[PDB]
């Protein structure tokens, strides 16, 4: 039982965090051109930036400690610091709550995302199994961002009060209970002692090319989402029906990307899904400067969400293959590098990177984050055969 059931646990533990981070979307409206939103965004920019820096600064401290504690207690902090955040939103009268309420969730996201991916890395040892399995587990992000806003928005308008958080606190304790049974995560058990120290993974070039590819893929969508024309007009008229829908294309395309390139990327060679993984991000972003209508953003969202899925699902199992080929196999830490790289685009990119566009115009910030991705694609020639220890 245990091998296969931990995929269902880590899928659900990624789904609920990725649904919870996204159900705040139709709530945000309570607080001349499609990219001028860079200037209106700054309040919303801080809601994307806060979760991702508090999650990012935590990744070394969860990833390192996972080796000392054992995996199960970090996954339980992943359920729990995210659950107490779910309950916190249920009486958020002001932005303050939202901002801090997010901060607690960031820690839960780390606790869940690093230790859960390390649990799949530890448990699924063969590359074909680990590719199919991590592609399906990363399908938790892709299903969470899709499922969450349509459900959250319909409850927020039709049922009212703060209902979309109480019904999610119902589903989060169901996952927490299923962890208490399936993992038996109430015991103190350490991992193989004094394994690879993170500075030595960070000084090996071959892990950086994979982590960098996971980061630079996310950076293209991280500048885009905070500054969509989705926040101001929606209060006034029946166009509010678009408030939850705008992520649906990027989050169907991620699902098919992480699900298909969970199986196919192993077979063709995963390096070609960083090369054709960031060529597609870059060219999909490069259609944004020719949009002048929100419908014109549906096409570039779909190729970004697909290509994010093709990179993540191909490069997350490369983290495991590299510690299995150049280092010592304790995955408490390498997934700390992979997850800060995933996360950092949302931490840094919206606000610190948003300062680029205001002096220049925003179609230049989008076109350049596009080229930085087509230029990264040939750098993965180092991942054809990482030379053995
Ligand atoms: C309201 O806040 C947030 C909203 C959203 C995200 C993150 C947020 O906060 C940090 C995720 C993060 C991801 O994983 C990407 C999934 C895509 C490729 C389908 C992009 N966006 C989708 C919406």
Helix H, strand E, coil C: the string for the chain is CHHHHHHHHHHHHHHHHHHHHHHCHHHHHHCCCCCCHHHHCHHHHHHHHHHHHHHHHHHHHHHHHHHHHCCHHHHHHHHHHHHHHHHHHCCCCCHHHHHHHHHHHHHHHHHHHHHHHHHHHHHCCCHHHHHHHHHHHHHHHHHHHHHHHHHHHHHHHHCCCCHHHHHHHHHHHHHHHHHHHHCCCCCCCCCCCCCCCHHHHHCCHHHHHHHHHHHHHHHHHHHHHHHCCCCCHHHCCHHHHHCCHHHHHHHHHHHHHHHHHHHHHHHHCCCHHHHHHHHHHHHHHCCHHHCCCHHHHHHHHHHHHHHHHHHHHHHHHHHHHHHHHHCCCCHHHHHHHHHHHHHHHHHHHHHHHHHHHCCCCHHHHHHHHHHHHHCCHHHHHHHCCCCCC
Residue 22 Cα to ligand 1 midpoint, Å, equals 7
User: How big is the chain by its Cα radius of gyration, in Å?
Assistant: 20
- Hey, what are 336's tokens? 């700390």
Q: Is 92 helix (H, G, I), strand (E, B) or coil?
A: coil
Nearest in space to 86 (alpha carbons), one of 153, 24, 143, 8: 24
Are 26 and 245 in contact by the 8 Å Cβ rule? The answer is no
- Hey, what are 134's tokens? 């991590």
How crowded is residue 36: how many other Cβ atoms within 10 Å of its Cβ?
13
Cite the annotated binding site for serotonin by residue number: 141, 145, 218, 221, 225, 247, 254, 312, 346
Residue 385 Cα to ligand 1 midpoint, Å, equals 33
Q: Which residue has the tokens 């960098």?
A: 212
Nearest in space to 38 (alpha carbons), one of 385, 352, 271: 352
Nearest in space to 52 (alpha carbons), one of 106, 101, 15, 116: 106
Are 82 and 63 in contact by the 8 Å Cβ rule? The answer is no
Does any domain span residue 273?
A: yes
362: CATH: 1.20.1250.20
In whole angstroms, give the CA distance from residue 219 to residue 370. Answer: 9
Q: How many Cα atoms occupy the beta-carbon half-sphere of 374 within 13 Å?
A: 11
Full residue range of the structural domain in which residue 16 is found: 2-186+195-383
Does any domain span residue 389?
A: no
Residue 164 Cα to ligand 1 midpoint, Å, equals 18
Q: Is 275 helix (H, G, I), strand (E, B) or coil?
A: helix
Closest approach atom of ligand 1 to CA 25: 1
The overall longest dimension of the chain from CA atoms, in Å, is 62
In whole angstroms, give the CA distance from residue 217 to residue 342. Answer: 8
Residue owning the nearest CA to atom 9 of ligand 1: 48
Are 206 and 322 in contact by the 8 Å Cβ rule? The answer is yes
Does any domain span residue 388?
A: no
HEC string for 304-336: HHHHHHHHHHHHHHHHHHHHHHHCCCCHHHHHH
Count of all residues that appear for the chain in the document:
389
Q: What is the DSSP letter of 358?
A: T
In whole angstroms, give the CA distance from residue 354 to residue 41. Answer: 10
Residue-wise DSSP of 214-232: HHHHHHHHHHHGGGSTTSS
Residue 251 Cα to ligand 1 midpoint, Å, equals 9
Query: Which residues in 103-233 belong to E strands, given as ranges?
Result: none
Are 25 and 244 in contact by the 8 Å Cβ rule? The answer is yes
Closest approach atom of ligand 1 to CA 24: 1
Ramachandran quadrant class, 225 (left: phi over 0; alpha: psi -120 to 50; beta: rest): alpha
Ramachandran quadrant class, 12 (left: phi over 0; alpha: psi -120 to 50; beta: rest): alpha
Are 278 and 359 in contact by the 8 Å Cβ rule? The answer is no
**Residues near ligand 1 with C-beta < 6 Å?**
21-22, 24-25, 48, 51-52, 141, 145, 221, 225, 247, 250-251, 254, 305, 308, 346
Ligand 1, pocket-test mutation among 55, 143, 225, 245, most atoms within 8 A of CB: 225
Does any domain span residue 16?
A: yes
- Hey, what are 1's tokens? 């039982």
CA distances (Å), origin 148, targets 196, 247, 318: 37, 10, 29
Q: What angle do CA 48, 52, 57 make, to 5 degrees?
A: 150
In whole angstroms, give the CA distance from residue 58 to residue 261. Answer: 29
- Hey, what are 172's tokens? 């989060």
Ligand 1, pocket-test mutation among 21, 298, 345, most atoms within 8 A of CB: 21
Residue-wise DSSP of 102-119: HHHHHHHHHHHHHHHHHH
How crowded is residue 176: how many other Cβ atoms within 10 Å of its Cβ?
18
Cite the annotated binding site by residue number: 141, 145, 218, 221, 225, 247, 254, 312, 346
Nearest in space to 300 (alpha carbons), one of 212, 230, 221, 219: 221
Does any domain span residue 52?
A: yes
Are 255 and 142 in contact by the 8 Å Cβ rule? The answer is yes
Does any domain span residue 366?
A: yes
Closest approach atom of ligand 1 to CA 146: 19
CA distances (Å), origin 375, targets 123, 250, 284, 309, 332: 35, 22, 14, 19, 31
Does any domain span residue 285?
A: yes
Ligand 1, pocket-test mutation among 346, 347, 348, 349, most atoms within 8 A of CB: 346
Are 227 and 41 in contact by the 8 Å Cβ rule? The answer is yes
Alpha carbon dihedral 97, 99, 103, 108, in 10-degree steps, equals 70
- Classify residue 317 by burial, with Cβ atoms within 10 Å: 0-12, 13-18, 19+: buried
Residue 222 Cα to ligand 1 midpoint, Å, equals 8
**How many domains are there within the chain?**
1
User: Dihedral of CA 143/145/150/154: which sign?
Assistant: positive
Residue owning the nearest CA to atom 19 of ligand 1: 251
Residue 387 Cα to ligand 1 midpoint, Å, equals 35
Supply the angle between the helices 298-326 and 205-224 in degrees, to the nearest 10.
160
- Hey, what are 64's tokens? 């390192």
Closest approach atom of ligand 1 to CA 346: 10
In whole angstroms, give the CA distance from residue 84 to residue 172. Answer: 10
Q: What is the DSSP letter of 296?
A: G
Which residues have C-beta within 8 Å of that of residue 61, sequence separation ≥ 6? none
- Hey, what are 204's tokens? 């090996």
Residue 198 Cα to ligand 1 midpoint, Å, equals 27
Distance from chain centroid for Cα 131? 17
Residue 48 Cα to ligand 1 midpoint, Å, equals 8
Nearest in space to 271 (alpha carbons), one of 380, 377, 121, 348: 380
Residue owning the nearest CA to atom 20 of ligand 1: 221
b vs e for 99-123, b when ≥16 Cβ sit within 10 Å of the residue's Cβ? bebbebbbbbbbbbbbbbbbbbbbb
Are 304 and 220 in contact by the 8 Å Cβ rule? The answer is yes
In whole angstroms, give the CA distance from residue 350 to residue 365. Answer: 11
Residue owning the nearest CA to atom 4 of ligand 1: 22
Which method was used? cryo-EM
How crowded is residue 351: how many other Cβ atoms within 10 Å of its Cβ?
17
Residue owning the nearest CA to atom 14 of ligand 1: 141
Which residues have C-beta within 8 Å of that of residue 33, sequence separation ≥ 6? none
Does any domain span residue 232?
A: yes
Q: What is the DSSP letter of 352?
A: I
- Hey, what are 290's tokens? 């020719």
Residue 194 Cα to ligand 1 midpoint, Å, equals 35
Are 140 and 21 in contact by the 8 Å Cβ rule? The answer is no
In whole angstroms, give the CA distance from residue 104 to residue 124. Answer: 30
How crowded is residue 326: how many other Cβ atoms within 10 Å of its Cβ?
17
Resolution (A): 3.1
In whole angstroms, give the CA distance from residue 21 to residue 67. Answer: 27
- Hey, what are 260's tokens? 């298909």
Residue 150 Cα to ligand 1 midpoint, Å, equals 14
- Classify residue 244 by burial, with Cβ atoms within 10 Å: 0-12, 13-18, 19+: buried
Nearest in space to 152 (alpha carbons), one of 241, 19, 13, 247: 19
């Amino acid at each position: 039982k245990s091998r296969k059931l931990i995929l269902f646990i880590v899928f659900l533990a990624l789904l609920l965090d990725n649904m919870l981070l996204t159900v705040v979307v139709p709530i945000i409206p309570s607080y001349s051109e499609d990219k001028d939103l860079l200037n209106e965004n700054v309040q919303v920019g801080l809601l994307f930036a806060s979760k991702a820096t508090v999650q990012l600064i935590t990744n070394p401290f969860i990833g390192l400690l996972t080796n000392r504690i054992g995996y199960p207690i970090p996954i339980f902090a992943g359920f729990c610091i995210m659950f107490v955040s779910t309950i916190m939103f249920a009486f958020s009268s002001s932005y303050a709550f939202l901002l801090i309420a997010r901060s607690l969730q960031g820690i839960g996201s780390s606790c869940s995302s690093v230790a859960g991916m390390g649990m799949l890395a530890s448990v699924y040892t063969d590359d074909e199994e680990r590719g199919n399995v991590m592609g399906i587990a990363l399908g938790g992000l892709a299903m969470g961002v899709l499922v969450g806003p349509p459900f959250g928005s319909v409850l927020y308008e039709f049922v009212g009060k703060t209902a979309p958080f109480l019904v999610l606190a119902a589903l989060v304790l169901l996952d927490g209970a299923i962890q208490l049974f399936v993992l038996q995560p109430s015991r103190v058990q350490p991992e193989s002692q004094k394994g690879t120290p993170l500075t030595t993974l960070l000084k090996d070039p071959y892990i950086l090319i994979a982590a960098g590819s996971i980061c630079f893929a996310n950076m293209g969508i991280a500048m885009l989402e905070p500054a969509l024309p989705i926040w101001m007009m929606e209060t006034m008229c029946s166009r509010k029906w678009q408030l939850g829908v705008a992520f649906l294309p990027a989050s169907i395309s991620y699902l098919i990307g992480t699900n298909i390139f969970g199986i196919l990327a192993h077979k063709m060679g995963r390096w070609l899904c960083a090369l054709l993984g960031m060529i597609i991000v870059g060219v999909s972003i490069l259609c944004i400067p020719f949009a002048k209508n929100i419908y014109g953003l549906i096409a570039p969202n779909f190729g970004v969400g697909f290509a994010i899925g093709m990179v993540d699902s191909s490069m997350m199992p490369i983290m495991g293959y590299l510690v299995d080929l150049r280092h010592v196999s304790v995955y408490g830490s390498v997934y700390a590098i992979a997850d800060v790289a995933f996360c950092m685009g949302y931490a840094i990119g919206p606000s610190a990177g948003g300062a680029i566009a205001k002096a220049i115009g925003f179609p230049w910030l989008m076109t350049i984050i596009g080229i930085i991705d087509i230029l990264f694609a040939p750098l993965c020639f180092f991942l054809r055969s990482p030379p053995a220890k």
